[PDB]
Chain length 511, copies 4
């Protein structure tokens, strides 16, 4: 009965849950959906979407409303509800930083700018972001987080909670770093040796070592060390996997640090964050860029040999749903949609104007399909054998290289039969496909609004035979056969529309 | 267990109901919805709208169909039904005047123009309005009203009925005053001393004292004294608060008296009516002017230090619903929509072509929101601490000054998140906000189709902190907490859509 | 317990049913809806429409399928069903003529053109209409009709059946008369004395007496005498009222006889039919002319001092519904819509493409309204005191003279409140009003999509007072009060929309 | 209690089921709807459509997954379900050929191109079609088919299964014939004597006898003999009727053999297939040509004196539904729509994008109408006395010759009453009519979106009388009368809309 753990070796990764790889199919409630009196607007939405994991804020202001006086009653209530509604949990520690700011820190923290000081701009102004350099703020956050992880260990031997997110989009808007004297005395000092090593540099001060990027790298290092110390102390009580989430900078035309949240784990300081954070298992992007080229580039930059891809947040508008499968195709640990409840809040223009059964349906389709084979899909991801893709506007055909023997053509917006002319694509980009290689000649295949045409990748497989195309579902790891597709259903690839269908396809050659 | 009473001192007012301030959230049935056989088309509409007070006609013709033979059986039935359906009552005495005319007076009154004479025009014609100068008509109305108030005292110790409206839009169409000899002998006489005092004038006859306005002021005085005598005699039996309602003249381009109902409490004879009517607690406007500038000007003119604002009637078309909150913002006693039943009558073009759940929804939203905190809202109004505003077409932003420390920006038609560009306003003007100052740093806030952004009003509060933003409801005066809004839900003001939500917002500063 | 009877004296008429005047609010099933196995598609439509009288074919071919072998089992079944579904019946004897033809005569009649000969054209051709001159055909029809009326007397002491229609649109298409030798020997003879008397003519042969109209008048006389003899023999067994129905000729631009059904009771041979038919109580028009001027002219021509108006058939398209009230305004005996069942037959373009709750609603509204006061309305018609009108396209205002004291203005398509501008009319012509004078100052008033404004018709009533405007219903002749309309509901006339409402309006004058 | 049998003599044909002629009103499930776990998406669609016969694949790969190891469990389950849901079955043997290919043959067949060789092109390439010349493939298919028919005999004494289809669209895409040496040695040989006889030719080799068509005729003969041998061996175990289905070549502009499936029973090798296949009862077209002229021409070419017409497959788009009645008008054995289940597969553009109650309704209408008289309709077809027609775009009138005495005019898109102008046709071509001659003067008539006007075909019947027009249904062969249509319902022909109605019309003449 092992607890959840994150493993990563030689560029292959797994979130182990109950002793086997697990893929997070996640939903995050809105930021103020973290009280008993509002949960009856959370669970009905989850029942429609059907995530296997729900992200919920655990606010520092609610568990330590007065210093030393802890209250974990909402954690207790939430664990009971998640167990009743059959989901795992990822708890979000809203503390020193939530979207750069201290708004979720307790009254006795965020109103006391002397004991818990804010970042000071170069021009001398205090701004709405707590300085990472103050020992008092670190001590207070870590104490509450330690008490949190101690409580969790006592009341969750079921391991309902599988990961913790310490802080939420840490970083600073409105200044590249802290310019207070306390900060400057550290910025004037020598760059720590660990960072010199990891960055392949020569010793010196921050200004000497990093030049024009010293301010931003200093801030990223200082935030990273701050959260790493919290993660280390919490893991000493209850060593759940832990990750931080990034408010992104633009992948192609980023602004200046401070326009984006400086110091957060943005795509230019990933090495700094890895060096600062040996106790942080991964750096997760929060992706609200609906354009295909931007979204998929962010996925590629955060999927590294030293970083399992977890899309911790993404939009809940219907065009976002299709990005689930390409995310899983990077063989990370999963993907989560943000803003899933019926509280009538909307983060439009980032997300949907409303959350209801219609807006959730495109998301539920993928969650249902993956859930039909989640443990085999997760095993495949743990071995780097998952492939996934989403439809790009203006391109009705994609090619997926599977292995030496087979490839898959993905065609969007076509009939499930012979068609004349070039594939038109779906009227809106809504298609996706997901393929796991189970063995060299057998694949798990699902998709929607799309045709998947497996075909030979070499002369050795030119004489292709469909041996079986079994529709069915897995119970855990046991395959439950429904029917063998054949005839019209495989003559023009295998075609998916709007219902979740999993196909276990065994290929052969005639000899 | 005190009876209802109206208190007013130094420009602050309260309708005391069950020993505490009360705000009327009212609905008035149509003019012929005052019989047992039609009430099953009243209560289903009230169940949807959810008023806390219902206005119903009590017709002189129904309670004294023959002289001396009183019948209060409908009053009895109505009290039972209002108690069953959990509303308070305001009873409208349809007697000497209903919309200037005697149509609701009994057969033995309105067919006898000798004993109960009509106004005579300057040219000698009797018109459809009873003369205020006839002692017989005053005596007969007052007798029936006294018997009415005696009956009410006996059968309503519960105080279901909280106010009485003697007469209904008294005044005269088609003549500025009565020109009959009976009238002229009074018009030739000396202006009574009380009116000379209140009007800051020198003694004389009506023509000497008031000049070109003598005819209209004489008529207003004479009607005012007539109704005051009825109110005084009724209050001697059962001293419920009492008010009269005004058919309005145009605020900017009024016609001549007689085109509008001359002698009624129009905005140019309010002092005359106050002098004539020490036993009439307030002069209430009936507002069927949907244009923002006209509607809000009428509110300002009738909200005086000597006159608590009560909007006794207003339209039931959807654009009217938003005027509830600016009305309450004048710290009067409430607001009532006219024409609320399912009898299939329509007073379009003044009001809605139909009354159903769709047309009532915009009204129900505000009634539900205010009802969630009605007694605290009424306490705030009794202290002059209520603020309210409605959306004006072409203006997407309003500013509300709250106190020395805080103000509120009201923004219409915007996302509940960051938006680029100037606020567009709602496509139709439908937004409103209502704010009560509970203490210098704590406010009750609700609105719809609107964003409320509290912000510093002085250098002393520049370092603004949201201490709590508690969503919840009051049970009487006891606050029932649901959740604390934070994060996305307060980063861009607090945003309201189409559901009733009450926020108790405590502000702080970091130090 | 009297049987139904028709009375007519000095231009005033009544269908007496159960000892008092009765107004037929009728529905006729389609022509093949006269068998047990199809009645379950009749009664559900009647339940929606709510007629008080249903017309049903009784086919000669079904009650005498072989000569001498009578079968009245469907009559028995139908009486049971009409009693169960609470309607009266008018039975249509489909025999020698149905729409000019013998198609409903038994096999042994309509296939035997020797014993039962057809009309012969001038050029020698037999056409699809039976000759009225053959004694064999008269004898056979009359025998079956006598057996029919004998059976009815035995099995209907309840008087479910209130009238009989002998034949159905008798007349001849394709020839003005019979030109066979049998016919010519009668045409050559002397005009019978009774017809010479009634037509104010001098004796002679048909050609001498009537000139160019001799052929058509001869045919009308001969058909009239034929049916009169059947009616006389049937009435001798069971003297129910009896009427014949007319396929109309054009009121303004009629064709030639034979294009229209020559010999039928068309508007130019009404005197001939009255002379030929002393045992036929009335001549009823079948009106499928939707244009206002044509429809109302037909009503005027068939409403005579010697002819009570009964609209035996009219269209079931929605524009026809409004013609009910002007029909009743001629103080005849009622009005019936044709084609009322759910068999999925349509007589479009004459009638509606479908029969369902939507197409029936405009008809049901009037039937419900009249049924709320049917016996008082019928009493008023029996005295010539009913007034009715329907909306004409392009005319939004009509005036109804009621008596010396009062008139009514009918205004179409206006608000139920003050409106600026000229009345626009309803977008389609759908309005109607019905007014019964109960006494000189009291009226029964109903309407739909219309305003009724009673107003003085003389200087004596200039000082008009609404004494009562009672909404309610009658149970038999007992008035059941609901409420008194007043205020807004009578300030702009009394306004009717889409629900059935009956108002008993007592007018007064102030003195 | 006879088993099903096919009889054909002198150009008249019958499928005898339970001892009497039977007309297949068929539905075929999709190609992968042949497993227990998917049948719950078959029967709900059949319940809506209401076929009397369902076609289901029986796949060689499922009944002999390993050689010698038979498994008929799905056959057993399917028989139980068809009996429960009250349909007959036609089982489709998916074996050596399914749409030219071996995809439904077992693993040990289709992956072994040595023992079970594919067709070789002229240029030397193996293509996806099994060669008919290999004795091993014939032996293996026939063995499995024999075991299949043996099993069926044991478990289906109820005769739920009425026909078998050996193979499915046999033929070859991509080559006119096999060019392998094995094939060429047969092609070089002498044409068998039976084919020389039937083709009215002189002896010789294939190239000598048939010239430019030798390749295609050789292939058709070789496939025909292959399947005939299977049919003969299966019939020896259980002699159910058997048929083959044809992937069609274009009727007017066919491509080359190999573009269409060469060797299949295309319209140019019907004589070859008749000569090769004395044990194959008929050659059935699969018609996915929606254009009227192409569809009806295919019907005419496959309806031969030596070939009963069975439309084994046709489209499930709504325009196809109307082709049922003209198919039955060729006096064959029935008609079946392809793709009838709720699995969410679509063979659009050939068929409908979706299968649901709306898309099935036009098909269900005809199935319900024919089912109301199926055994009399089948008796009439067995005697060549069925007549049927469908609406052609641009032609609103058709004439059907019935016999010497009567004809029927079919008019599309007109009212059920008199209309002015030329018939417009239905907006889309949707009408059809079906007429059985029961005796010289009595007909069974049904249709939809159409008028049927019976009229004289000779001077002897000029004096036409409708004797009876009985609406009703048959229970087996017993007529159950509902009503006699007359009057309006027969004055303008008999008119059909969207509900199933069967009329038994007896015609007479008056004398």
């Amino acid at each position: 009965t092992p607890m959840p753990q994150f493993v990563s070796k030689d560029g292959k990764h797994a979130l182990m849950v109950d002793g086997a790889p697990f893929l997070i199919l996640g939903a995050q409630v809105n930021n103020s959906s973290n009280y008993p009196g509002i949960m009856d607007k959370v669970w009905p939405a989850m029942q429609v979407l059907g995530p296997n994991t729900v992200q919920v804020p655990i606010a520092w202001e609610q568990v330590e409303p007065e210093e030393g006086r802890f209250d974990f009653s909402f954690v207790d209530t939430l664990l009971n509800q998640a167990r009743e509604h059959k989901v795992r949990l990822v708890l979000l520690w809203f503390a020193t930083w939530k979207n750069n700011g201290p708004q979720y820190a307790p009254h006795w923290v965020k109103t006391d700018n002397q004991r818990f000081p804010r970042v000071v701009t170069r021009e001398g102004k205090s701004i709405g972001s707590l300085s990472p350099h103050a020992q008092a703020t670190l001590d207070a956050d870590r104490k509450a987080f330690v008490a949190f992880m101690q409580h969790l260990k006592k009341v969750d031997p079921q391991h309902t909670v599988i990961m913790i997110q310490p802080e939420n989009e840490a970083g600073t808007y409105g200044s590249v770093r802290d310019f207070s004297p306390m900060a400057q005395k550290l910025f004037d000092g020598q760059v720590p040796d660990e960072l010199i090593k990891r960055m392949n540099k020569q010793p010196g001060t921050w200004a000497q070592v990093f030049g024009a990027d010293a301010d931003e790298i200093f801030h990223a290092w200082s935030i990273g060390r701050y959260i790493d110390q919290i993660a280390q102390a919490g893991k000493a009580e209850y060593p759940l996997p832990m990750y931080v989430n990034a408010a992104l900078r633009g992948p192609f035309n980023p602004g200046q640090p401070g326009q984006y949240a400086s110091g957060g784990p943005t795509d230019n300081v990933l090495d700094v964050w890895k060096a600062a954070g040996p106790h942080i298992d991964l750096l997760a992007p929060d992706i609200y860029m609906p354009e295909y080229r931007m979204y998929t580039t962010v996925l590629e930059r955060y999927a590294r040999p030293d970083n399992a891809l977890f899309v911790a947040e993404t939009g809940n508008r219907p065009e976002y749903a299709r990005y689930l499968y390409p995310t899983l195709g990077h063989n990370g640990i999963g993907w989560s949609a943000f803003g899933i409840d019926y509280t009538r809040y909307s983060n439009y223009p980032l997300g949907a104007k409303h959350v209801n059964e219609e807006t959730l349906a495109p998301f539920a389709l993928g969650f249902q399909a993956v859930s039909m084979g989640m443990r085999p899909f997760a095993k495949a991801a743990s071995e780097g054998k998952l492939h996934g893709t989403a439809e790009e506007p203006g391109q009705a055909v994609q090619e997926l290289k599977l292995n030496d023997r087979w490839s898959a053509t993905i065609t969007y917006g076509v009939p499930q039969f012979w068609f004349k002319g070039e594939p038109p694509g779906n009227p809106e980009p809504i298609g996706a496909a997901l393929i796991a290689e189970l063995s060299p000649d057998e694949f798990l295949v699902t998709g929607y609004h799309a045709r998947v045409t497996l075909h030979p990748a070499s002369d050795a497989t030119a004489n292709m035979i469909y041996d079986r195309v079994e529709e069915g579902v897995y119970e855990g790891n046991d395959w439950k056969f429904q029917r063998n597709w054949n005839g019209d259903q495989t003559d023009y690839g295998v075609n998916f529309s709007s219902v979740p269908q999993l196909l276990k396809i065994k290929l052969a050659t005639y000899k």
